[PDB]
């Protein structure tokens, strides 16, 4: 019970491929839009890359990496290493490491900071260190 259209008006391709209830529509308009639609999925494989730029803001995929980048920011989903960047405030998630590095760290809560450690802690410091009770 299907229907299948394939147009070229002034506006552009107005493809829609419809079953009785389902459908998939794809426009490539002249006003500068691309509208894909479906009723289950849009699956799109490759073999090396997928790069989606809007003026120096990537989302790129390789065999190993997944960049989520702009200027002054990046998330690397590298293999066995996550790097999250603002300059300068890093969080590096390695195999057996969470390095949480910046110039200044603020930590708030409302209830607890329930720290445990299966071996010794080494809180190094300098000039001052305070507490309250």
């Amino acid at each position: 019970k299907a229907d299948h259209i394939f147009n070229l008006e002034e506006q552009g391709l107005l493809i829609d491929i419809k079953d009785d209830s389902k459908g998939c529509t794809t426009k490539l308009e002249s006003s500068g839009k691309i509208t894909h639609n479906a009723t289950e999925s849009i699956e799109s494989s490759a073999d090396k890359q997928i790069i989606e730029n809007v003026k120096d803001s990537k989302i790129s995929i390789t065999e190993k990496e997944i960049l989520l980048a702009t200027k002054k920011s990046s998330i690397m989903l590298s293999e066995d290493k996550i790097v999250i960047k603002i300059g300068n405030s890093l969080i590096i998630l390695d195999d057996s490491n969470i390095s949480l590095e910046s110039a200044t760290i603020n930590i708030k809560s409302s209830a607890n900071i329930n720290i445990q450690a299966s071996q010794n802690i080494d809180i190094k410091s300098l000039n001052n260190s305070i507490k309250a009770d």
């Binding site: 019970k1 229907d3 299948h4 259209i5 394939f6 147009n7």
Partner: protein, 93 residues
């Protein structure tokens, strides 16, 4: 072209001598109009057995539709060119 003489065509036949006959003229058609030439201006062809085609240029008072259609059972292909809309491809069932 190769358009052979199908059946249900009606034809003038000379007999030029004893055991000599020929074929001259064609008195039939299969694709015509049935309207008053103010509503449609057909220029078309039917093709093949069952005549399940068209190559028509139908010019009404609102459009000028080129067509390369087929009318099968459970399948309706086409190729349409309007003036207002534009180049079409269609499957229907």
């Amino acid at each position: 072209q190769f358009i052979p003489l199908r059946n249900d065509d009606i034809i003038l036949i000379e007999i030029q001598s004893f055991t000599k006959g020929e074929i001259i003229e064609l008195i039939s058609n299969s694709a015509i109009s049935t309207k008053k030439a103010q509503q449609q201006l057909l220029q078309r062809q039917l093709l093949g057995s069952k005549e399940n085609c068209e190559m028509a240029y139908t010019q009404t008072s609102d459009s000028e539709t080129f067509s390369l259609t087929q009318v099968n059972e459970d399948c309706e292909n086409s190729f349409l060119i309007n003036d207002k809309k534009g180049i079409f491809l269609r499957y229907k069932s």
